[PDB]
Symmetry: C6
Subunit: 264 residues, 6 copies
């Protein structure tokens, strides 16, 4: 259950071990998540251990508070260096598990991300606080009023943000991440309204982890698009995920959702 | 098995196959340069798998049950010196003796047939008109296509190529939806290394006597689309451009000449 | 003492504190990502120093006599793998229980209060109106401010942060003049990594329940000033813009809302 | 006759050995060829061994087919890392061997490259198939009709392309390379119509190998120049080599050749 | 007194030694000087040894000529690699020593640099030869008439230029450096009239060494600003140092000096 | 002999000469920084060769028979730390006592005399009017100049400099045609490192009391030519601009002043 931090495989026998152990071959319960030039991994056994403990608990708020570190351990960054070579141009398999059904965020919503997008000050963070959410995971944003009085959980890195969201959604709760600010800032690639196009692939990768898990996670993203190129940028963002809600001046201006039987 | 971490450090080891961590391709290894990556296909493992798949009752099930053989069919060699030893590597353009084609068009050169166009141009739904055996889904978000239809989802470029190669050598008709991560991941008004990557993969298909259909959204601007589309067309056997759900342009290199098409 | 050159090379060493050359923060270590750098504050050493400073007759003299303790309070960990282990690291946004503020404004969120504007806008002299305990001078040329007035000059970002943190935890009011070297030294129409660096430092202040005033000349063009100033304001608790010696704009995030100001 | 692939000189005694052996000092029969950031080497003893065997053979087509690997071994990429330092800003000596004469491509043509240049689709590949050539070496281009029925030889990398061209021309035959596409794509430097100026130096380096060898090699180059800047780009290309033919819409539009007694 | 050139600290005990010895911790008489991505160090004991020997000498010109190498050893580049990490965003402390007084270049001039700025051919070098200077240190400029007949001392690198200037000024003489040409060329960072903004921080760092030493050094700087953006660039240069004189067509057009009691 | 691969790893080895793999120039070694490269001339070997050449019946034959001595005269030191130890290295501007000049012009400063202009401006043929001893051909395609005329062809920058230095110290008049590969190979509207490279080589000539004529095609645009030509002229002793075969501008720094010329 311990993650290798420094020591990676140097022999072929060691290279065959799990990512957790410092090898190069995912175990059956490890899914790699490419994000820019990083490769993370979710351990779906740890994930469902935590999610089941939450969902089955007589006091899930208390279990959460007492096991935050275990929850955060669901997603980690493997130590082995050769992953980019061994798995070229890695993505995540687009899947929908058998018997998937959804009423939230909308009826028959495809599993994946539901993005809440808009410019600086558009009201995305406030929009969340008015949806019927279980928990807002606060990451990479300056401390605001949202952090003093709401149902929030503050985290420090992308492992923690994804771990809490995955565990909460797998348990049957409704999580949102506010926000992917540090992905927008951190990811760099060939541009297409000045947007690093690797942002789109990162959102698709995380989206498809959600799809394989049969969950929807709501996520705030300010892509930093100029006024002219915002329509194109939002279209490419919507084409990368299951659903999108656009905020302009505190009001919803557009919403599009891929559904099990269509696209709305 | 493929060597994952131990590479040649002596001249004797360097003479061994790419699979074994050496620098010299064995009789049945073909190197595939893709951007700054170098992959390899083992044509003996390939035709092994193609024979096994040909006697299968479910192509889709065979692939899901044989991920070990697929990763043996196309892999990324561990030896670091390949870029230096094989300067400006491509794949040699060949046509096997006795090659015949009626799909996608009559006398179509073996190679890639690109299905290209902008976001939401209808490329994914266009594949439904092409009498394909199945669509290999890669790098795209989970969509209606992935739950209703003959698809096989993969995670990386080795897997996408291996499945398509095995399918085509067995006599089936594959498409890859899509090469999105080549567009985003290759960086060098599009990076010229996208064009050489398509020529390299195209010529592997030419050596194998196969045609693989491939979706590409190049993320070009309206001003530069016409240029980027010619550059793409000059890299491959054939190309079909979609706009707003309809074919607007087509060009195919054939065994004795060239065809063109113009629509709306 | 802080490890300067020997870092963890075994899994057992990796579990040790950042101070000791490991990769896992001890109970009282908080990582501070700044561009491609990762610093750490030790909150136990911090409150040690804050108690010692609180019983001092000269804050300025105490700092000059305790450079060893200051370099123990904020330091740059030696272990190289931190960027990989903690992906897209930020600082978690928190507000300590019982936090109260009347300075710089009523109910001001803990965080940074930026004093911003172009060259010669009057930022350094503006600090004289803010009832500060002293101005921490960093990255600026020797000026009249440095010979006449309550200043303490430092050389690097660890020192600037440590002095400000110790001062504020002890109940004094610090300003840093200036973050010039963050503007110049962070590079990635301003580098987006300046914004994430300010959010990270801001949220360390939020966790500590303090406000630190900080001068920033972002070197933006007249055309882009309005945009860069919103991006800066969206990264921190509060911001005051100077033009030609006068406040032209202000915005502050408070415990229950937001304030704005407009001048000439 | 074996080329060092992994093991390079680590002592001064080893550094004095030939490039073939992993040393840093060319033997009398090794000529280094700088191409972008690469350094190749032609072994002129292997070259003239192959060329003489071809030229003296009762069945040169059969000798070629039976010795393709030996032919390809004429040019290799040395393993030693310090070559760029030891030979700063390396080029190739401009020489014309005593008693040089030429009737092909034109009368009294300077030894060197004869470039066939023009934009995408301009008819360069077809132009070759109408010159009185012995062999077209196909490299880096997608498989086309040219590869099914003509006198062609398909290769994979720049070593092979140069080896076959040098050997064929030294034997008294007339070779062309279609094309230097992967040099245009692969080489990057300070631009001057957007053309990486290291393209010009690569063509001069290869040109001067041809001049030292007393041969002319015809080479297709599509420099990817915009319409506006094509006149300047073609002029700089002509200034880098012995001769140039420009194709526009399948017709020759300009031709310029440096001659032993003038410039036409 | 010997400087470590190759061997740096590899243990914590060694890391605690002086920069001269290959450690990471400045001795009490070492001041680090960040310049772009370099870190130099001035040894103030060697500095004042040389300066006192000069100032006390019955024949200071002869002592200078006989001890040039010792003078040049006052500033060196430490060998230890971790300095950028250990001292994040390093600058130099802005200080003015107690009892500082100045009549040169102007009355009550702040200690620091006095920049002589202007475009190519503006007359900066000639301007120096008309000020009442003791010595012009010539660095990085092509040999000109200034080097044949004047009171000059030619040096090769930034250590030597700073060493001679510091020693001369500490001895009570009046030095100028003509010029910082290689800093302008060598330093690269995010731009703000195309000027690498790390140029401003380098000038502030060197300025503050002068301020800590209670000296003024005159320095020629041609920032290579375009005509349009020169006013802004000169303003940012003046904001980085104690004083500035601008030359246009061989005449002084602007002069600004920070004084102990004001700014002129 | 020059060390090619073994460099200093102890402080004792570091004190040895550059030739021997150390970091400290011997009495007669002068470092020559060129872009990111650092070369060295050994002035004792130089004057050895100049005496031998002076008693030669064919300068051209002497050079071809003494490639070993030429590579001992200018070489690239193996030690890696030189950039750090000698920050922003240049060459000190000097004029030897007793220097006199009548070529290329009266009282011409020792240094480079650049012959500059665009493609086909007539720079190579202009050298025929300058009463040269021979033209050192480097980096240019084989031309009529190379078969008819007094030329000596070389391959790299060490060779070009060494031949020119030896020729000039022996009393002959060398020109280098051309520095093309400095223009293409130095990259940092021209890279400013071209200008500092010319100043460094210029000042080596100044220390040696020689003038070397050098052709440069800087590849500037018509809009930027005037600026790039001043920047080049401000880097060297003298410069002549060619347009369409005729001198259009000239400037020369002399022992006591400056000359200028204007043509068509
Ligand atoms: Mg928000
Ligand atoms: Mg699609
Ligand atoms: Mg200020
Ligand atoms: Mg062609
Ligand atoms: Mg000057
Ligand atoms: Mg010429």
């Amino acid at each position: 259950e311990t993650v290798a931090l420094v020591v990676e495989a140097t022999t072929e026998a060691e290279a065959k071990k799990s990512l957790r152990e410092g090898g190069l071959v995912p175990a059956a319960h490890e899914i790699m998540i490419p994000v820019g030039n990083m490769i993370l991994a979710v351990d779906t056994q740890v994930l469902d251990k935590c999610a089941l403990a939450l969902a089955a608990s007589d006091d899930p708020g208390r279990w959460f508070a007492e096991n935050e570190s275990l929850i955060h351990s669901t997603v980690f960054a493997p130590v082995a260096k050769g992953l980019h070579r061994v798995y070229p141009l890695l993505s995540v398999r687009p899947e929908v598990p058998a018997g998937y059904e959804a009423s939230w965020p909308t009826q028959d919503h495809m599993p994946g991300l539901h993005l809440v997008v808009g410019g600086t000050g558009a009201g995305k963070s406030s929009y969340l606080a008015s949806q019927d959410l279980t928990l807002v995971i606060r990451w990479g944003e300056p401390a605001e009023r949202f952090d003093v009085e709401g149902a929030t959980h503050a985290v420090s890195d992308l492992n923690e943000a994804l771990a809490v969201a995955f565990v909460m959604a797998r348990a049957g709760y409704r999580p949102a991440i506010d926000s992917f600010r540090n992905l927008v800032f951190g990811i760099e690639s060939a541009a297409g309204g000045g947007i690093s196009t690797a942002l789109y692939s990162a959102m698709t990768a995380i989206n498809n982890v959600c799809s394989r898990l049969g969950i929807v996670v709501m996520v705030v993203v300010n892509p930093m698009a100029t006024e002219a190129k915002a329509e194109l940028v939002y279209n490419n963002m919507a084409a990368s995920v299951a659903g999108m809600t656009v905020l302009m001046d505190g009001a919803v201006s557009k919403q599009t959702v891929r559904t099990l039987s269509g696209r709305t």
